[PDB]
Amino acid sequence: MRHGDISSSHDTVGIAVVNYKMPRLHTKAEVIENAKKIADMVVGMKQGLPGMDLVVFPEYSTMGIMYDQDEMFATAASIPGEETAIFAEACKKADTWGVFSLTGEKHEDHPNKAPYNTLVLINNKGEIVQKYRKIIPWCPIEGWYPGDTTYVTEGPKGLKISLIVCDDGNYPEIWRDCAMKGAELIVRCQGYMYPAKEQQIMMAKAMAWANNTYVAVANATGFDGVYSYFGHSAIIGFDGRTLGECGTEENGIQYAEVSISQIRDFRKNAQSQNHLFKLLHRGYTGLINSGEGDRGVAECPFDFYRTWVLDAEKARENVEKITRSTVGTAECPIQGIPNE
Amino acid sequence: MRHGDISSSHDTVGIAVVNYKMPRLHTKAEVIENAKKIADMVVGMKQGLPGMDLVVFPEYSTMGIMYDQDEMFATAASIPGEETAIFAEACKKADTWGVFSLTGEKHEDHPNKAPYNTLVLINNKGEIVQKYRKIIPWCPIEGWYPGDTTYVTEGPKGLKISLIVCDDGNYPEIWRDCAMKGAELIVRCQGYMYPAKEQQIMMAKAMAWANNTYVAVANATGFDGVYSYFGHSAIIGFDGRTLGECGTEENGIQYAEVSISQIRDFRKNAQSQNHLFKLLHRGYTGLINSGEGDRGVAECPFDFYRTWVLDAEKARENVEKITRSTVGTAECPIQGIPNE
Amino acid sequence: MRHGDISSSHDTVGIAVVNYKMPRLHTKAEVIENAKKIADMVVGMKQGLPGMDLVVFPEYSTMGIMYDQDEMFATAASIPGEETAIFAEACKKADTWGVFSLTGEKHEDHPNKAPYNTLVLINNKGEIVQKYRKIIPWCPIEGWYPGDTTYVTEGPKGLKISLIVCDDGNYPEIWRDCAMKGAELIVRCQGYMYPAKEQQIMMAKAMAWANNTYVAVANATGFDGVYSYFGHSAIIGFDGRTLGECGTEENGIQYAEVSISQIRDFRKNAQSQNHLFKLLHRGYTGLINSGEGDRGVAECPFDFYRTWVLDAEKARENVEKITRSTVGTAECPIQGIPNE
Amino acid sequence: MRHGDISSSHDTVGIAVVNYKMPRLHTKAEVIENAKKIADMVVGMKQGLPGMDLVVFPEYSTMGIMYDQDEMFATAASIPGEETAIFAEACKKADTWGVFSLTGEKHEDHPNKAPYNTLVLINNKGEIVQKYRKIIPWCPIEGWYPGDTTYVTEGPKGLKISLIVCDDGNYPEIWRDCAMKGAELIVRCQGYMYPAKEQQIMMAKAMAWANNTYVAVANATGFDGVYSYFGHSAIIGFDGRTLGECGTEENGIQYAEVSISQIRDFRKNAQSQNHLFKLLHRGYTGLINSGEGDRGVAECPFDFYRTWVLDAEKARENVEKITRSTVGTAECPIQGIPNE
Amino acid sequence: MRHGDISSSHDTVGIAVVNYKMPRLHTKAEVIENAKKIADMVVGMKQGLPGMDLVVFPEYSTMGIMYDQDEMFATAASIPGEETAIFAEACKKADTWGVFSLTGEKHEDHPNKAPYNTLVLINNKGEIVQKYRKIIPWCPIEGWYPGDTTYVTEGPKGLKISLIVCDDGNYPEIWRDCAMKGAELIVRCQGYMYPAKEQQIMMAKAMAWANNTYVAVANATGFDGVYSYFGHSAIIGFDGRTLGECGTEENGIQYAEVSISQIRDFRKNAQSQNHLFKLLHRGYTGLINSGEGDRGVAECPFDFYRTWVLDAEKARENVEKITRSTVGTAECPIQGIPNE
Amino acid sequence: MRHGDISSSHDTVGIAVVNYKMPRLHTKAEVIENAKKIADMVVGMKQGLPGMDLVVFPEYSTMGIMYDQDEMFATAASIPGEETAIFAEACKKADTWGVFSLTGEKHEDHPNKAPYNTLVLINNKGEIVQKYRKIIPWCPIEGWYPGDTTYVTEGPKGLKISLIVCDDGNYPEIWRDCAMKGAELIVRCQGYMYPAKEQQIMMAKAMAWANNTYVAVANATGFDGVYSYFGHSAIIGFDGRTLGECGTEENGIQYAEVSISQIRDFRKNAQSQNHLFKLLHRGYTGLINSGEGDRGVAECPFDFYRTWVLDAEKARENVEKITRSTVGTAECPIQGIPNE
């Protein structure tokens, strides 16, 4: 957990994040050409950052956002496929792990159902070792089919990694889910468009803190014909302090070393802010002093989670009362989104 | 949701938060004397802030922290009791609602079990309308008996209010639970000691954003013989932007107007960042476009919450593997906290 | 007055501001081509921001700065004209109002007098509803003919709008003049070159506060052969707090919702910081308590404004004593600017 | 215009500002005792800051705020009087100029009309050389009789000084009026209570910039039974950059050196941001190039100022349409302030 | 190197720094009484921070600044002496190391020469293990006799510690000297008075970076009759990033864990920003590639240091040409400091 | 020392710094073409900044970084040479001094030894008046031959200038060496790649303060195939306060006026923070009061500098004990850098 050098040691994973300029593409050939530009970038970056063990690119960095539905279906990727092979070759040549984005990934029922929005973690031998599908697409605008699962994978130097995508990170539940599965680094890849710049910078830091986890964010930059993306790719320590952060600049890079021993030492020995531990051992001091054993209280005291798990339809009905009953609003209608 | 004036309107709730200097007390008589100082402060503040509808004091602002166990038991409050009556009279005289702290509140089995750490919301007629007991005491140091329930109460001008305490706010689950019960303002009262100043400032803002809720924080200040408290009492908008924030100064005050219509308009009409709505209607656009109905997906996709709700002991066992198995650590032992 | 979403409601005007990359143009054909790029950008942005009701482009975003005098005269626009028709079509297609820049607009005595530096507000039906000519050109460098009038126009959802340009905003008088005419949003369009980046960021916020008015700023970006423009387009609340702000990035966008009801509620009910009201009712409490009626004092107590209005030549003579008597300085001479 | 040292030179005026802790006083004897504490503080500060030429205390630093009307009248000061003599002796002993606050100063018709809220500038020989009465009392709460005049006085080393008070500084007109009278330093003394902390910090800087003037702010601190005062006393350069700024701490001090030659050199030779010059020579380049002489345009183009000067009652009527017609609001009533 | 918890581990040294309120004392009895208050504070802090291994108090925290020469001599301490014994007992009772200030420490020729300004490092067994005398007193105001030596001492858990005082830290040479002796933590104790608040915050961070060293700063707070002290006690990582920082509040505390293994791993394996290594192996890559061996260049290329070491009188003469020849200036005279 | 205007006076040097976009070049013809682009930029900037007296471009702005060894040797420049003549013509035409980068400059033994990394200062008559070779190349990556000398040159309006390059600025010794030679402005030209953005921003400010010197930084921007450069070109006052600073934007420019009289007045009359003076007159007050003469102590008290000057090999051996013995590390090997 230290910032400023280009090296890494047996204790540290050298992580690079990329403010990748958002592509404006339309065809499979264009996507392939851009995939090879990403590959060239990985290999060049390694020449400058000899400590690099993990390189992270934004959501949409391969395809851009395929606004046209026909182009969306025509450019939807197979995984593994040609794009991933191109990335895998760069990971091998540069002896680094990498996180890349396929938007979309063909649905099982392609082309009759919406593609997934997908991340892969590729190891330094070119093997895909995690494939994550976005659980919370950025509706209403995003039409991707939602995924349903988080994963944890042993990463470079044994650092445990989970992937999440963009809108996912607004929801503290996903970060919690990953950390509770044992994640030591949560990688948030995004094409996060303005307006919500400051909110997203703050969210990543707050989630690093709340879940005692390293966080790396790669966010797109530039204007793509529709959105302007605000960058601020970052690596953040498990104590909630930014290691390094980019500005809004096209193809900015940040690089930091995250210590394997430090996070494990903290998770073992931290007390007042060992949030993962404390959530499942509430009021331990009080119970000890009250003659009630030495483990605190594990039981979930929050009705929302009990209801959501038991009766998701009831939780949905409850939230519609507080918000609205239809996915769209007649005050700001969107074609294909019902309202009223 | 606006800041800078001392007024309030039929649309806005005028909220004041107090950087109350942490008392260093030892006896019931001293606690009573300090309760009357708080009462005098409420009445004086109202003279300067004619818009004030809600005034918020820090956790521990009534008793301070009773480090001595005998003094802790001797000063534990009844609710309702003498302290609350003193506060209630000030709320009536100043025609304001108030949030006050009783640390401790007598356990049902007093003095044979640890007291609770408790907040009350008192209305402008002097009636206690919410009583909240801290669900996550700040272990290891805090020996309070943990509470088990969150509440929502109709507040001034119909603004829906939930109370939480200090360490509670590190855990996104509690903020979620309150907002999903319909809370429009979450009031976090704290005696939040250094070190974790910047982390706590960031958490409140991030939670305001994540849960589309107004947030008010009152935090103690000064040195009490053991801890120094970092202040930064604040009122924050539902869009994650600070309204007003104090520094670390003793008896600082902030004051802001929170609009009832604005939060309700947002919760109805916001789309891309309507987090409460979107969490229970995931990927609605994708499902519509895939011919699968117009509600998105409600089901909880996060195994941690499913496991915690179904089998809290399993969730506890899982987290002990990632952290440690005993509440204490032999590397930093604490008397009365078992380890090793 | 809220930030982070892409929606808007019947209560809120969705405002987008654009960090438009400064063009480097030389011919009428090039200007037309760039006008169509702006039009394409408006239509694309609306696809991503369905709440958008108003889109704002920087001063000079259509022509760039025509440094060459011959090119300046050759590219000076008619209003209405071809450029405005191109913009009007985009406003109609995207169902949004827009603010666009014509630099220059032909003088009545074209080509024998300097063109104006002009903004138009175009409604969602493609109609020009305000035309503003820069009252304070950025002399010495800017050679535009000064305008003489501010305007207020009913805008989207009835939001009252005034336009001002770049250097204008350094002078608190213009913001005052607009707000006192009833403006609820002041739109500052600029091609504000470095050096004065931080000063301009601060000015917009301070003027929002001082005049209890929403402020939107669109500023150019990039290097154009002569100047580098610092971006930081922004939308600011009437309470002086930034809603959203861009960085220095080319073609950054910000977007915020400004509430019609909130500003009107504030202007009615705010007291201590109701600056528009208080300026014309000074010391009302004192006069009441002194038996002198209940309106305070309206009379202007500032000799500078009395003198400027009555005897502008005297005010000019007075200021020349404090500064210098000639428009140029021999210590930093500029061709065509007399000194010495 | 430089910060960090305790010295001053023949070119620089050493200015100290004081975050003076707000007194809570009730009697004339208490006021006198506090005046002598201020005097002792002046003499001590000079021992530590040998460059000090000017020392500035907050509005209300002598009396505190006399909330009780009877006490207000009983403690209203004569000027010159006992309090000013006490201050004058300290200025002589410490060989410094000083700015002090008398709240109230007896009205000409004392005790039958409200006192003034007054500042004095005392020179190093103990002579009162400026007496300023607050033109914009902070209504509704403040009941002081409004003053009607700004002043400029030759200060230490010939630095030209104007005094303004607290609420005055929210109104850009007063800063303009002082600078146009030739002020080189505007001293804003305040007892500026929370909420509006960030807005006031920003205002002082923005006004320094807009009027090309040094600014010194002394603001009170602490809680006085009614308000908490936010400090942030500051000295700011004529280029809008803070020299030094205090936090919210009780009895904080800042100290900076302001160069006489620098401001005079700037006012002579600055061009693009010579705001005082440019306001009265608008569009000079354009007029030259259009064959219309070399002075630009002086005439006031802002109808608000023309109307206010000619017909203040009309300006008042106009603003009441935009705000409200009565000084009070029935939505937030205040005893003695009419509404409805 | 992590922040937020109250614990520490076998790998981390738990460091607390104290914003100690500056005493205003006059007699030996008063100094002793205050020393016991510091002792009580150490023991209380340990109850709240069970990880604490090192506690740091400001320069002057024991005596305050003895402005009166007679009182200065009467209160000058012996080391070891009564004050240090009081501190030593607290270190033993709280099982912590501590850094304390003796101002003054009796000169060898007391009372005929000025006392030293001195820090002691006391271990958890109550033994004084380092005594440092300020090498750069804060002249002209400070009249302490200058010390001449820096030290490095094995500290808690083997962390190597050097002490420096206040004004010392403005001079990069002292930080370099300590780090090159092997220091892993440089402790800067200060009574750093306003004006130079922001400069001092920045210096500590910059020196942490430049010397790849942990830095802890304890600074005084409050007003002492002459100066106001700006606090901002801090612990900073060897990568230049703040761990935790106080504000200006009286008796603020910060606490952070500094990893022994992290700094040693960095000093071994860092490359591009291994400043200690690189300074003595300049251009190693270039020399290798030029066929000139594999060590780079060690020789000092800076004439100033060569001259200062060889001919300090020449270096002094050189600097007097750039500045002034006498220690005082007639433009800002100070009694006892010659000028002219 | 003032910021915001485009003018300059007889007292001020108008300094422009350029966030020049990093070139990606391969051939001599490409370098020449880019040199002419820089020349065109100088002439254009002068049209917009009539006060400009000095223009500063980043290290590598002429060649980019020649990663290919063959291309490095093929494009190594003669000085004076074709590139410098191109720059000299622009300086003459625009009547400005300029700082330009030649990377590499041919070694005396070209092409058999590594080129130098070189800056030239060219006056307004096109004459090269300083040539500086980087003393601390950014090893391990940079293979330039190290230079050995700093210089001071009389610059525009007599302002004394020293040049340093990029990695040089991490080492406080070089800034000290320049200031002690009489430098009034230190110009740091850099191609400073991410990661170390915040550290470099802080270093420049801290060095301005520590050495009481103006500082100008020009840093590259953009991605060049290997590194992304973080911009933040800046001009900083001798009191450590930023005048103007760029963001990370490609071809950003900042411009500020630095006063000749202000720095000379400060160096003469400053006392408490006259660091250049005080370093060579330590404890003057103490020695005076102790009867030991009126000059303080000049002797160097820091063993590191004494050892480095006398026995550089010993200093190297000492530092290898604290860090590592070989220039490379087997934990992060780099081809051509020995380790193990």
Short mmCIF file of C-alpha atoms in Angstrom, two decimals, chain D residues 107-289:
data_model
loop_
_atom_site.label_atom_id
_atom_site.label_comp_id
_atom_site.label_asym_id
_atom_site.label_seq_id
_atom_site.Cartn_x
_atom_site.Cartn_y
_atom_site.Cartn_z
CA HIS D 107 -27.16 57.16 18.25
CA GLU D 108 -27.38 60.98 18.08
CA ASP D 109 -30.83 60.47 19.67
CA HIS D 110 -29.68 57.90 22.26
CA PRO D 111 -31.45 56.19 23.97
CA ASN D 112 -34.57 56.82 21.83
CA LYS D 113 -33.17 55.36 18.58
CA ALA D 114 -31.15 52.19 17.94
CA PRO D 115 -27.33 52.46 18.34
CA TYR D 116 -24.98 52.20 15.37
CA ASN D 117 -22.69 49.27 14.68
CA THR D 118 -19.31 50.98 14.35
CA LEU D 119 -15.64 50.49 13.47
CA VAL D 120 -12.75 52.80 14.22
CA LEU D 121 -9.33 52.93 12.64
CA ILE D 122 -6.83 54.23 15.20
CA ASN D 123 -3.33 55.24 14.12
CA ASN D 124 0.00 54.52 15.89
CA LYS D 125 -0.30 57.90 17.70
CA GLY D 126 -3.65 56.82 19.19
CA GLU D 127 -5.74 59.08 16.95
CA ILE D 128 -9.10 57.93 15.51
CA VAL D 129 -8.73 58.56 11.78
CA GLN D 130 -11.80 56.74 10.44
CA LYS D 131 -15.17 55.96 11.99
CA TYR D 132 -17.44 53.70 9.92
CA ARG D 133 -21.08 52.82 10.69
CA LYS D 134 -22.47 49.58 9.20
CA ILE D 135 -24.57 50.44 6.13
CA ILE D 136 -26.21 47.00 5.90
CA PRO D 137 -27.10 45.63 9.34
CA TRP D 138 -27.68 41.84 9.35
CA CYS D 139 -31.48 42.01 9.45
CA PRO D 140 -33.79 40.56 10.58
CA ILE D 141 -31.77 39.65 13.75
CA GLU D 142 -29.59 42.80 13.97
CA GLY D 143 -31.39 45.90 15.22
CA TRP D 144 -28.62 48.48 14.65
CA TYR D 145 -29.40 51.82 13.01
CA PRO D 146 -27.96 51.76 9.45
CA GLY D 147 -25.05 54.05 8.55
CA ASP D 148 -24.87 55.80 5.18
CA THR D 149 -21.27 56.51 4.15
CA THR D 150 -18.01 54.77 3.21
CA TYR D 151 -14.59 56.36 3.86
CA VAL D 152 -11.00 56.08 2.67
CA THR D 153 -8.11 57.07 4.96
CA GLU D 154 -4.34 57.20 4.48
CA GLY D 155 -3.07 54.35 6.67
CA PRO D 156 0.27 52.97 7.75
CA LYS D 157 3.03 53.71 5.21
CA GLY D 158 0.41 55.57 3.12
CA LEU D 159 -1.68 52.44 2.40
CA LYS D 160 -5.24 53.64 1.67
CA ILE D 161 -7.82 51.95 3.90
CA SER D 162 -11.62 51.54 3.95
CA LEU D 163 -13.59 49.74 6.67
CA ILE D 164 -16.74 47.65 6.16
CA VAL D 165 -18.68 45.34 8.55
CA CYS D 166 -19.82 41.71 8.23
CA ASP D 167 -23.13 41.64 6.29
CA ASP D 168 -21.91 44.64 4.24
CA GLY D 169 -19.47 42.28 2.44
CA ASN D 170 -22.25 40.17 0.88
CA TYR D 171 -23.03 43.17 -1.33
CA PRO D 172 -20.44 43.76 -4.08
CA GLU D 173 -21.53 47.42 -4.32
CA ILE D 174 -19.81 48.38 -1.05
CA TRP D 175 -16.44 46.89 -2.06
CA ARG D 176 -16.76 48.67 -5.44
CA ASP D 177 -17.60 51.98 -3.72
CA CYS D 178 -14.52 51.76 -1.48
CA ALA D 179 -12.08 50.78 -4.27
CA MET D 180 -13.45 53.53 -6.54
CA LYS D 181 -12.78 56.04 -3.74
CA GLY D 182 -9.16 54.86 -3.95
CA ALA D 183 -9.03 52.17 -1.22
CA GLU D 184 -6.01 49.86 -1.51
CA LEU D 185 -7.03 47.73 1.46
CA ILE D 186 -10.60 46.93 2.43
CA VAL D 187 -10.88 45.71 6.00
CA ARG D 188 -13.94 43.57 6.68
CA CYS D 189 -14.55 43.09 10.41
CA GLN D 190 -17.22 40.54 11.28
CA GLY D 191 -19.01 38.44 13.85
CA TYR D 192 -20.12 36.08 11.10
CA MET D 193 -22.08 33.23 12.60
CA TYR D 194 -22.60 29.84 11.06
CA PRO D 195 -24.31 28.72 8.75
CA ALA D 196 -22.65 30.65 5.86
CA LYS D 197 -18.96 29.69 6.39
CA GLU D 198 -17.83 28.65 2.89
CA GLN D 199 -19.84 31.45 1.24
CA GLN D 200 -18.07 34.11 3.31
CA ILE D 201 -14.60 32.67 2.64
CA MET D 202 -15.36 32.78 -1.09
CA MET D 203 -16.89 36.30 -1.03
CA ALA D 204 -13.79 37.97 0.43
CA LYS D 205 -11.53 36.39 -2.20
CA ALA D 206 -13.93 37.19 -5.05
CA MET D 207 -14.15 40.84 -3.93
CA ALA D 208 -10.36 41.16 -3.66
CA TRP D 209 -10.21 40.02 -7.30
CA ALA D 210 -13.17 42.02 -8.64
CA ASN D 211 -11.91 45.30 -7.15
CA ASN D 212 -8.13 44.75 -7.48
CA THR D 213 -7.76 45.47 -3.77
CA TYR D 214 -6.06 43.91 -0.74
CA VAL D 215 -8.63 42.50 1.69
CA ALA D 216 -8.26 41.73 5.38
CA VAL D 217 -11.01 39.91 7.28
CA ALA D 218 -11.17 39.48 11.04
CA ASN D 219 -13.96 37.16 12.17
CA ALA D 220 -15.06 36.09 15.64
CA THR D 221 -14.96 32.52 16.94
CA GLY D 222 -16.59 30.40 19.63
CA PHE D 223 -20.14 29.95 20.87
CA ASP D 224 -21.75 32.90 22.72
CA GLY D 225 -25.00 31.37 23.98
CA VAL D 226 -26.81 32.00 20.69
CA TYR D 227 -24.44 31.72 17.70
CA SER D 228 -21.25 29.87 16.87
CA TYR D 229 -18.83 32.05 14.84
CA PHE D 230 -16.71 30.34 12.16
CA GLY D 231 -13.40 32.31 12.22
CA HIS D 232 -11.45 32.08 8.92
CA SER D 233 -9.97 35.52 9.42
CA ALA D 234 -7.79 36.08 6.35
CA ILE D 235 -5.57 38.44 4.38
CA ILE D 236 -6.06 38.21 0.60
CA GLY D 237 -4.04 39.68 -2.29
CA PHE D 238 -5.41 42.02 -4.96
CA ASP D 239 -5.08 39.12 -7.42
CA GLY D 240 -7.69 37.11 -5.48
CA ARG D 241 -5.20 34.66 -3.91
CA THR D 242 -5.31 34.12 -0.15
CA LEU D 243 -2.17 35.25 1.65
CA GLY D 244 -2.95 33.58 4.98
CA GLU D 245 -6.20 32.26 6.46
CA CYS D 246 -7.17 31.08 9.96
CA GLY D 247 -9.35 28.03 10.68
CA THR D 248 -12.29 28.10 13.13
CA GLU D 249 -9.97 28.13 16.20
CA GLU D 250 -10.55 30.53 19.12
CA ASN D 251 -7.99 33.39 19.09
CA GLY D 252 -6.26 32.28 15.92
CA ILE D 253 -4.15 34.99 14.30
CA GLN D 254 -3.00 35.49 10.73
CA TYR D 255 -0.30 37.88 9.55
CA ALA D 256 0.78 38.94 6.06
CA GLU D 257 2.78 41.69 4.35
CA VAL D 258 0.97 43.76 1.73
CA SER D 259 3.18 45.68 -0.73
CA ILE D 260 2.33 49.29 -1.42
CA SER D 261 4.36 49.35 -4.63
CA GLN D 262 2.82 46.12 -6.00
CA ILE D 263 -0.80 47.32 -5.88
CA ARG D 264 0.12 50.71 -7.37
CA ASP D 265 2.22 49.04 -10.10
CA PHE D 266 -0.70 46.70 -10.87
CA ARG D 267 -3.32 49.46 -10.96
CA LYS D 268 -1.07 51.40 -13.37
CA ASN D 269 0.12 48.57 -15.65
CA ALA D 270 -2.37 45.67 -15.48
CA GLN D 271 -4.49 45.42 -18.64
CA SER D 272 -6.80 42.45 -19.16
CA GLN D 273 -7.89 42.32 -15.49
CA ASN D 274 -7.58 45.98 -14.55
CA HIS D 275 -11.25 45.90 -13.53
CA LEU D 276 -11.40 49.40 -12.02
CA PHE D 277 -10.03 50.90 -15.23
CA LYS D 278 -11.97 48.69 -17.65
CA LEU D 279 -15.42 49.26 -16.13
CA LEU D 280 -15.27 52.94 -17.20
CA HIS D 281 -13.56 52.39 -20.61
CA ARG D 282 -15.64 49.55 -22.09
CA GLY D 283 -14.75 48.19 -25.54
CA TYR D 284 -11.84 50.58 -26.10
CA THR D 285 -10.17 48.38 -28.70
CA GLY D 286 -13.44 48.05 -30.67
CA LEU D 287 -14.08 51.82 -30.66
CA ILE D 288 -10.52 52.61 -31.75
CA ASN D 289 -10.79 50.11 -34.62
#
